[PDB]
Amino acid sequence: APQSITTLPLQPDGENRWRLPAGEYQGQFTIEQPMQLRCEPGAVIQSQGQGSSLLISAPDVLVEGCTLYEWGSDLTAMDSAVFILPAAERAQISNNRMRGPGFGVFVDGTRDVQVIGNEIDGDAGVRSQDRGNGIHLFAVSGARVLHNHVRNARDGIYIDTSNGNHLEGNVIEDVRYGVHYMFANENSLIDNVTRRTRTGYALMQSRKLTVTGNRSEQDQNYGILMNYITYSTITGNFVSDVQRGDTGGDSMISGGEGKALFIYNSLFNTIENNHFEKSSLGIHLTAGSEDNRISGNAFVGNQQQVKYVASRTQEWSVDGRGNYWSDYLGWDRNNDGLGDIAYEPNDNVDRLLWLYPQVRLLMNSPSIEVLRWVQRAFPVIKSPGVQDSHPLMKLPTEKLLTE
Amino acid sequence: NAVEIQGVSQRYGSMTVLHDLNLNLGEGEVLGLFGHNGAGKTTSMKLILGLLSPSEGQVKVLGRAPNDPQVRRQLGYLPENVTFYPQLSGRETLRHFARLKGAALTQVDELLEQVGLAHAADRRVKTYSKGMRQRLGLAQALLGEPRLLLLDQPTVGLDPIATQDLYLLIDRLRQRGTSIILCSHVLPGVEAHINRAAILAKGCLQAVGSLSQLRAEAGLPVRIRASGISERDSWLQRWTDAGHSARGLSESSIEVVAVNGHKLVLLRQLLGEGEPEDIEIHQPSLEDLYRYYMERAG
Amino acid sequence: NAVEIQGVSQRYGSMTVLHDLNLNLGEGEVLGLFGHNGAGKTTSMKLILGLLSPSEGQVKVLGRAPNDPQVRRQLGYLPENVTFYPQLSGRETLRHFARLKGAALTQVDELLEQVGLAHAADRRVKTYSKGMRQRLGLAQALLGEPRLLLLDQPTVGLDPIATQDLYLLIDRLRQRGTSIILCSHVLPGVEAHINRAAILAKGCLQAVGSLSQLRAEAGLPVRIRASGISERDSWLQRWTDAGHSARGLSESSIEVVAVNGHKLVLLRQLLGEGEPEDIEIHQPSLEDLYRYYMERAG
Amino acid sequence: NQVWNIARKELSDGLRNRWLLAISLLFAVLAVGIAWLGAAASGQLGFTSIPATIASLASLATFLMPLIALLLAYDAIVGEDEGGTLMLLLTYPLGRGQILLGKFVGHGLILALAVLIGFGCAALAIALLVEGVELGMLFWAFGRFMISSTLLGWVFLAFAYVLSGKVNEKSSAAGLALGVWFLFVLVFDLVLLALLVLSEGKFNPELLPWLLLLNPTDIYRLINLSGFEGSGSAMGVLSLGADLPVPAAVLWLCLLAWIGVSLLLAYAIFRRR
Amino acid sequence: NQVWNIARKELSDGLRNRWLLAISLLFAVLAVGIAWLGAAASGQLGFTSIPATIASLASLATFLMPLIALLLAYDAIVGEDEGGTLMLLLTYPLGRGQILLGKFVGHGLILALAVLIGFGCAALAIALLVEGVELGMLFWAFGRFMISSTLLGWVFLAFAYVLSGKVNEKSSAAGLALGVWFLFVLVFDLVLLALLVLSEGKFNPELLPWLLLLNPTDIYRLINLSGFELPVPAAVLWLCLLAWIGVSLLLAYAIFRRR
Numbered sequence A: 001a002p003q004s005i006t007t008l009p010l011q012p013d014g015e016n017r018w019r020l021p022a023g024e025y026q027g028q029f030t031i032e033q034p035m036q037l038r039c040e041p042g043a044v045i046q047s048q049g050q051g052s053s054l055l056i057s058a059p060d061v062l063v064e065g066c067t068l069y070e071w072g073s074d075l076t077a078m079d080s081a082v083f084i085l086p087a088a089e090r091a092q093i094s095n096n097r098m099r100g101p102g103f104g105v106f107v108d109g110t111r112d113v114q115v116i117g118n119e120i121d122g123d124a125g126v127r128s129q130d131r132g133n134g135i136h137l138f139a140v141s142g143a144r145v146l147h148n149h150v151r152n153a154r155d156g157i158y159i160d161t162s163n164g165n166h167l168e169g170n171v172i173e174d175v176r177y178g179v180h181y182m183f184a185n186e187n188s189l190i191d192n193v194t195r196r197t198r199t200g201y202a203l204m205q206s207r208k209l210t211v212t213g214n215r216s217e218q219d220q221n222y223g224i225l226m227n228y229i230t231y232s233t234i235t236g237n238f239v240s241d242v243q244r245g246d247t248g249g250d251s252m253i254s255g256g257e258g259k260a261l262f263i264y265n266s267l268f269n270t271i272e273n274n275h276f277e278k279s280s281l282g283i284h285l286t287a288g289s290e291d292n293r294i295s296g297n298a299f300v301g302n303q304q305q306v307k308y309v310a311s312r313t314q315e316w317s318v319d320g321r322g323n324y325w326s327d328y329l330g331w332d333r334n335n336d337g338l339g340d341i342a343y344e345p346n347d348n349v350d351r352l353l354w355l356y357p358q359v360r361l362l363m364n365s366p367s368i369e370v371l372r373w374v375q376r377a378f379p380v381i382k383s384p385g386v387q388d389s390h391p392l393m394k395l396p397t398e399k400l401l402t403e
Numbered sequence B, C: 001n002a003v004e005i006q007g008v009s010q011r012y013g014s015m016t017v018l019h020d021l022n023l024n025l026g027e028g029e030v031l032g033l034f035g036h037n038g039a040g041k042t043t044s045m046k047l048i049l050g051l052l053s054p055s056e057g058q059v060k061v062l063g064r065a066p067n068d069p070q071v072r073r074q075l076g077y078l079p080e081n082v083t084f085y086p087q088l089s090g091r092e093t094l095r096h097f098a099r100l101k102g103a104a105l106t107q108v109d110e111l112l113e114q115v116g117l118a119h120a121a122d123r124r125v126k127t128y129s130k131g132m133r134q135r136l137g138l139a140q141a142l143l144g145e146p147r148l149l150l151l152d153q154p155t156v157g158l159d160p161i162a163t164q165d166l167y168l169l170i171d172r173l174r175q176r177g178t179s180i181i182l183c184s185h186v187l188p189g190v191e192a193h194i195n196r197a198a199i200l201a202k203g204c205l206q207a208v209g210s211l212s213q214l215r216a217e218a219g220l221p222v223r224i225r226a227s228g229i230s231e232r233d234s235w236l237q238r239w240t241d242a243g244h245s246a247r248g249l250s251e252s253s254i255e256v257v258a259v260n261g262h263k264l265v266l267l268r269q270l271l272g273e274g275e276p277e278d279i280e281i282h283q284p285s286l287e288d289l290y291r292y293y294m295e296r297a298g
Numbered sequence D: 001n002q003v004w005n006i007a008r009k010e011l012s013d014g015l016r017n018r019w020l021l022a023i024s025l026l027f028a029v030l031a032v033g034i035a036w037l038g039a040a041a042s043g044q045l046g047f048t049s050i051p052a053t054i055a056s057l058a059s060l061a062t063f064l065m066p067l068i069a070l071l072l073a074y075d076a077i078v079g080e081d082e083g084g085t086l087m088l089l090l091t092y093p094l095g096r097g098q099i100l101l102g103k104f105v106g107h108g109l110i111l112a113l114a115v116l117i118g119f120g121c122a123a124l125a126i127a128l129l130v131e132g133v134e135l136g137m138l139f140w141a142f143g144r145f146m147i148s149s150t151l152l153g154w155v156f157l158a159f160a161y162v163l164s165g166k167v168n169e170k171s172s173a174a175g176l177a178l179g180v181w182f183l184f185v186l187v188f189d190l191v192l193l194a195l196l197v198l199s200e201g202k203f204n205p206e207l208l209p210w211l212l213l214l215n216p217t218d219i220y221r222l223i224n225l226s227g228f229e230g231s232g233s234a235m236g237v238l239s240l241g242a243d244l245p246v247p248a249a250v251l252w253l254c255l256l257a258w259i260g261v262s263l264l265l266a267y268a269i270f271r272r273r
Numbered sequence E: 001n002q003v004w005n006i007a008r009k010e011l012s013d014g015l016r017n018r019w020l021l022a023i024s025l026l027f028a029v030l031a032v033g034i035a036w037l038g039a040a041a042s043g044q045l046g047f048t049s050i051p052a053t054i055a056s057l058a059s060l061a062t063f064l065m066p067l068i069a070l071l072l073a074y075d076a077i078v079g080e081d082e083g084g085t086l087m088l089l090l091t092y093p094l095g096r097g098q099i100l101l102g103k104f105v106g107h108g109l110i111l112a113l114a115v116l117i118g119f120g121c122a123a124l125a126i127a128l129l130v131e132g133v134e135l136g137m138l139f140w141a142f143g144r145f146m147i148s149s150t151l152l153g154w155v156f157l158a159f160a161y162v163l164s165g166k167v168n169e170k171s172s173a174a175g176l177a178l179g180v181w182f183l184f185v186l187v188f189d190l191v192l193l194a195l196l197v198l199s200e201g202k203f204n205p206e207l208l209p210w211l212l213l214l215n216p217t218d219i220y221r222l223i224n225l226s227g228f229e230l231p232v233p234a235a236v237l238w239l240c241l242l243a244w245i246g247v248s249l250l251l252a253y254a255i256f257r258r259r
């Protein structure tokens, strides 16, 4: 309800550039001017705890070097820190420091927004029913979220039906859901880390997207949940240590013993060369998930590395890598770097081989391996998932461990 | 006429062990083979058994070649250095053997007391003695009722009470029409049961036939070793001039050795008026022929 | 004193095959063990060796216990049923045995021809004979300097031209202070060489000592055999009453035994009337001592 | 019979060999092992007491059921030749070849007695815990199995006999019996398998599973891994044998002919002993 | 020493046995065969320098290199005792352990001569055909294979001595000798999985680094992966396999002193 002129737009230089002095600015500011906000490090805006603190609806806004604290909490009224209209076109924000209750970034409808290097740690005092959504998108093309270090939120960065949508280098910690996706076709996310999150990658009913190089580090029971997304390219991505427990919410999910890759019904997807480390259940399947490409990936540490739930004979390994099963019995028999000695491992032996790595010595005893040879000759345990048919190598993608 | 060896020589690689050996054997004969310890006495039996092949001849044992097993039903054998399966009973080896020779269980039970091993049965052969192994080999030779026996040095480790007992068993088998082929090295004792001798060379035969006419061409002296026949000095020169010797030892002892023709009348002078204290007469024996024929051949 | 047994009995579980054997030995003697088969002679020298435990006592071998290799060096052993590795040169086995005895290869050459196997040396010993095994079996006991010697039927399958050759070799060995232990089954021959006999019972011992005092307690007749001397009638009636057994034959000869003190006084009268042709007389020997001592107890 | 007398002897010393009575116990715990184990998740598995798990046992008996036969008959000729009883045994009214087949089936019955009690408990192990299975096909599964093992157990007797007829030392008979265990089982499996990829890249691929019958031991797998079992799939050498269009008893008779060629060679070399 | 002399006997006994040196000809054709195996595709020895052929060669050695040791010393006491001639050696100035270890290292140098003429001739066959310049590794990684190859043979040769002194018949010392070949090759590895599949909660993973010591076979299959790349280091794994050597022989030596 204070205006733009309640703030002090000092212009030592022209070209609509406005240096800001230091000061304890008060009030929920309504900035309605194309503003080059060159804000002071000493300038601290203490908002009054009620209402959106920064309404911006004028286009061409450049925000740098600011901070703000304790804005509103009316989440039904969208009490964000910064409030953005569709009319706020090609706006930019950068270098902003937040410790207030409600939303960090509300954006809807507009195009070409740039969120570059932002320290938005809103509120973790609530039990993640009302901790606040961090960055809410709603059909916002041209989305640029860059290097944004965020904590203290409920369900994280929300993306709703956007198509120009780039997520580069952003680090999120300590949240219910890391990033949320509703119906946002041809998305693009790059090198993002989700530390101590009740899930990190929630993706629902989108399409055509690319998933590149995002590392899921120390996550709680759900790493990546694809839901109803065909044309899904997931490359170069790192998964470490999904674990036991719950999320608290369980709105449409089931946070449990630890599923590294929840898969819910892609028609087409090439998930190629991704690392998966030390889960409980490695690959969740759904029975409606078919026509997949999983070649080149990496499966270490996980206990029940694939939960094959389909009635389907899906191979999904097009002549590349049976994706580095650590429970892969069968040494390199053919005298080349080509392996391909058997089909996939799928049994209950993976639990104890996770529990005792020493028994892979006892696996390759020649008394056992001729008994293993008749089990491949006679699948008494009826599994339709032969599902590798080309390990064909020893070890891919060691370069994904560059933390 | 049982065993008919026909001029046979036998080799070993290039080394011969026989020089054209011809031999006959009737049915009441007992033949004692003697010679060196490499003379061919073991390997002679193996041609009779058909263990070898007669390279330079043939032999018709009972008119037939020895490779027929129906010949071997009336044939028994004991080898030298005889071994058995050493983990069995004494009766169990023989009852195994009785299945081969076709005799029933009513032979082994009295063949055990033919050698007197009634306590010794039902024990392991590796626990047995030398003679307790030897009587088991003696019993299988007497298994059934064969007509030809080849006792390849049967006197290995035998009681000299029991050694003459089987000679009586030879003599009982001699009157039962069974000719026995023998070789031995205890040279006394056997000769009373020897019908004909079979002394032979390294590769050759030396002589054949009975003991009496083989003493003819083996002119060998009769010997008297003594101490105190009558005197030394008066009983010295009256024997060397008689075509004999008289070894004048000084301690009242003369070794008069007569040359077996003038043994008739001179013993009336020697021990018909001589005064016996320690006198020992020696008839020229059959090992002395083995002394002689080794000096004849070699 | 070399070998000293102190009251020792020996069992095979319940089969106590030795009864209370106390037997000693000096340091230059020649011993003769005799008895039946199964009497324990092969068991005896095994107890002299470390092959069996002294169950009810102990042995003293050269003042020591037999499980010591410095005591187990200067003995010389030859067993019964001796056998070797059948695929080697027999000199090379003796060359292998010389490394175990420590004697050099300057001894294996003359010992091969002392037993006389150099004509057929350097072949397989399964291509040897029973004599040629035992002559090779003799030579391994001849290695080095055997102070003690142990001879378990050494004369089996040997030529009697060479059987007494080892007896002179035995007679060459006690002159250089080497006590031997000899058991045998041929009872003639050894009596020229045995210093002390040790004929023993079933499990027990019968008697010990040298030859002549063993002849004291045995009632011993001398034995006279004849064939057509002069008469049949007067020879029967002269000895049916005069303290002898006039065994009444009929071929003008009555084969009368004298009591060996009675041949001194009346055989001058006897064969003057019985004009003699070829007559041998038989002193009561160690073989004759044997069957009495066999029948002295069971 | 005259030939039965050593066969009556050959059971008794094998009875006297009180731990060759104990050949069956190691030959039974291979059955009751793999009755209750397997590759993975196999603690007390009665539902996977299938004939394919019995077809696993024939692949395990590819190795040792030859080798048990080699450790018996490798010294039944040479071990009594230099044991010093055959020259006694030639005197007894027997043919030289007459004593071979008596020692053949005398050794041929003791493992035949061992195999029907080596899985006779495994027959009753079905009755012990394996509920819900059909005994009638298992009657025909083991009838495909148990008599097929002992004829292969018979066929390595006469392999051991012709070497022990040939050689005249003890350890070289053992030294050659390990040789024929290697080349006639493990090498001859793969020499045809190494043939079929490059030298039979394109040369003459027509009569290839006819070449399998020179190896005898894979036929015993091909008798049993085919059997009446349904799958037979992806079996690295037996997929080649699945292309052999001869009927089922043709594989039965050639192994019986593999007896019949081999005993004639035993009659040869023992006549030249 | 006199203990060398019966070993000096036995070097003739592996050569005058012409077909006991010729078990290296068995040992060569496994080496030249499965190096050139290529059982999936090729059959022309492509990754011969890569120890996948050596780890395959270390696999099937556990079948038969225990078994080659079992075919020699199983009758070196009892067939000698059924041969009967050992008592003459006992009269000869010998310790019973001095009899035993010279009978051990006599046969222990038979197979030790057989590996480097059997496998080491095939090392030269790879050194003249594949043209892989691996002078540093094949001098060493074969040596970390072939000295284990004789040593796995050395414990099983000693494992034949612990029952060939026990029993009094030859074929019982081949029947009962197969039980340790049944154990250490086929079933003792197998019951460890059956131990593991029963107790999902128990059988703690710090116990099983000392359960690999109890099998002498799998530790031979443990130093295969030295150059190919562990809770237990290699130097203590070298000594525990030869810890089987001493506890076999004195167990045999007490048994050999009770005949």
Ligand SMILES: Nc1ncnc2c1ncn2[C@@H]1O[C@H](COP(=O)(O)OP(=O)(O)OP(=O)(O)O)[C@@H](O)[C@H]1O
Residues within 6 Å of the ligand: B012, B017, B035, B036, B037, B038, B039, B040, B041, B042, B043, B044, B080, C120, C126, C127, C128, C129, C130, C131, C132, C157, C158
């Ligand atoms: N199978 C064989 N191969 C080669 N040579 C042999 C064979 N058997 C024996 N010999 C040799 O041929 C000769 C045959 O003689 P034989 O064995 O009959 O001796 P022998 O006079 O009977 O002696 P003994 O009475 O001591 O046995 C022996 O000197 C032996 O060395």
Ligand SMILES: Nc1ncnc2c1ncn2[C@@H]1O[C@H](COP(=O)(O)OP(=O)(O)OP(=O)(O)O)[C@@H](O)[C@H]1O
Residues within 6 Å of the ligand: B126, B127, B128, B129, B130, B131, B132, B157, C012, C015, C017, C035, C036, C037, C038, C039, C040, C041, C042, C043, C044, C080
């Ligand atoms: N290993 C053994 N187990 C049981 N009893 C045995 C064993 N060895 C020998 N005996 C018994 O001890 C007795 C004596 O054996 P030994 O050979 O010493 O007597 P021996 O008079 O020397 O007979 P021989 O002169 O024929 O060798 C034998 O009759 C035998 O019954």
Ligand SMILES: [Mg+2]
Residues within 6 Å of the ligand: B040, B041, B042, B043, B080, B183, C129, C130
């Ligand atoms: Mg002879």
Ligand SMILES: [Mg+2]
Residues within 6 Å of the ligand: B129, B130, C038, C040, C041, C042, C043, C080
């Ligand atoms: Mg004796």
